[model samples]
Target: SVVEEHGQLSISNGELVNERGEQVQLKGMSSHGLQWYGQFVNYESMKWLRDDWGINVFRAAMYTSSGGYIDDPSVKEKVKEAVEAAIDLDIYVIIDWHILSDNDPNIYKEEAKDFFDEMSELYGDYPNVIYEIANEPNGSDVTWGNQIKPYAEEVIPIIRNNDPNNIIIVGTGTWSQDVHHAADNQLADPNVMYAFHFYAGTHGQNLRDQVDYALDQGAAIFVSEWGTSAATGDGGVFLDEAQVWIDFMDERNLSWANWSLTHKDESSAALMPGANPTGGWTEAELSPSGTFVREKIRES
Candidate 1:
């Protein structure tokens, strides 16, 4: 629906502007690492999220390391399935190159390049696709100026060479919470945005202030991943703080993808244990965080 209404998206004046030249916020879901949750990357389930959950965008998180594509390259098929499903559903989809255990993005530079090169060519003309080049580049030495930016500069052109004007999102420092670092040393490309992730229970007021500084510095930001739980992925839902985050994001007109869609029995997961993988989930099937995110989406 968002793709049909707004068409392609680009970064404009430190925010996401659609083809219509109006700022728009995308509310969506990010699948758990496809290696573990590949079963939910199918058309029927995604369609359910699109129609029933009213998600305007979807993220297919393809983990680069951590025994995902690095150990088994076949997960590309899962990514493709999600892209096709989202295209068919007429919603924006993010092909997230999720790098967690890998830490430094440059560790898989050639692998990332090869993946984006082929993915860009495959889904180049489709406005439904967005490229999140790096998930979270972290390490004491993984500076935006040194590692992350260089990787993005090298990889983005390959995607741009094939796909024209699809929004590209890069990861920031400190597991994507150091927006100020990226804000000061930003990419020269206007079509690019930076990722700022948070767990409401853990990432507090200071992190929000970091985002404010980045915005003040004219850096476009996207919350490519966040959760209602703690940053560790398990804890009681922090509804009040998550509400504060929702309010902050609303004020900024930022787009976001919730930290996960899975039945992993974690606080961040949207589904209850052994819930249906193909959608059609009921109130009984939702986890506490799941209920909160769904209500938030529906209210929006």
Candidate 2:
């Protein structure tokens, strides 16, 4: 079991380390959007991912603008359900404040602070809970020091106040592809990791080089979200390029989570439309990306 293998997760020497300070890489699926795919995150599905899919981590992306955390407050509880289930299953879970349409995280800064405060107070004691303060901070206007860093600086302390040990992942600029910027201007806290998102067809060797640079600069990296297709979430599957990224992540011992576990029609969605949300899906029910990621998860 992951709990037995890597007891309590922490950051050390720019890597995600277990309780004993051994470097550990975690791989798992991330929910598309909690408001839309909340049903797929129940206990049964989480248990299956742990026992069958060999997943050691899970990310619940609670969108801030798209009828999620800010628009519909109830969505917070839905994400909490997944967090609680991950705790029960003894797998690592990431509470993502999905910020896409809202390019700047400071737009909902106060709400984000409250959300993390409540979440940390509730799940602080558990090692399985990992807080992803910002999902993807995009737009050219957003800079590491100006926007994203300030948001993390504010919210990180809120979570640390309650849960001082669990790893916290912060998103970077250019939709989390600009890890080099974060590596150059990192947060003061050593316990946090920087998030790097990618799509095999869109972001390839160039992005990999950036990641390498970040690692060289001693920045802990985590692929909190990635896709087998293009960045738009709909396109041809680039298995060859994806394999290259996977090998890079494997060699570096970086933790990652596939883009999504929803049954949406998007190419990035792991489950095909109408597939059971509560697990128990056969190979025939998985999407092309799902099939590809399932094999990768099992291999890990």
Candidate 3:
């Protein structure tokens, strides 16, 4: 129903615009690394989030390294499973190449290219499909012009060749925090948006300044990944700071996917240990961060 109402999503005037030329925000949840949380990528859970929580988008975060896609390619099945359920619900789904420990994306240039090549062909005609080329290109040496841009320049065209109309999200430098660098050296694709990740307890005004710079430079930004904990993925929940971010995104109409959906025993995890892998999770089944994000998704 969400995709039916929004139709195909594109960029217009540095914003995500719907088919009717209206600026739209896609609010939803992102799956934890599929290698560990693959069980959560099911139709029932996805339907619950859409029907009950009002999430219009879902992200399948498939890690490229660290015993993930690179180590074992079969992990992609979980990603496709999530995509399938999102399509069934008519909600947007982001296929994220979750690059973390790999540091720079150039290391998996050919693999990423092949991966997108296959995915674009499979979901080319689906309006609910979105491709996030890189999850987080980190490290101090990872420059946008030399590393991220060039990597995207190659991988993006593979997806673009088949799915030219679907939105593509590219990760920025410094684990998706360097929005300014991306804005300064943007990709040529028009329907493209840049990824920005932040942990509310760890990122504040300094991070928002980078976003402001990106906006001023006319770069479309998507949260793509964020948490209420520290950047380490485990820490005390920070609802106070998260509200500030919610207010900022609300004012800008920026699309976002919270990090993440799992019972990983971390403050960022939405579900508690032994929570249901499917739907019908009660409030007691949710972690603190899960409770907060569920309410946020509901209000969206």
Model 3 segments more than 4 A misplaced: none
Give the candidates in order of lDDT, highest first.
3, 1, 2
**Per-residue lDDT of candidate 1, residues 90-201 (tens digit):** 9999999999889999999999999999999999999988899999988898888889989999999889899868899999988998899899998988889999999978
Q: In model 2, how many backbone clashes occur?
A: 0
Best by lDDT: 3
Error of 3 at 28 (Å): 0.8
In model 1, how large is the Cα lDDT of residue 186? 88
Pairs of residues clashing in candidate 3: none
TM per candidate comes to 0.98, 0.98, 0.98
Tens digit per residue, CA lDDT, model 2, 191-212: 8999999998785888889899
Better of 1 and 3 by lDDT: 3
* TM-score of candidate 3 against the unseen true structure: 0.98
lDDT of 2 at 70: 82
- Lowest summed lDDT window (length 10), candidate 2: 1-10
In model 2, how large is the Cα lDDT of residue 200?
84
Q: What's the lDDT for candidate 2? A: 0.90
Q: Number of clashes in model 3? A: 0
Clashes of each: 0, 0, 0
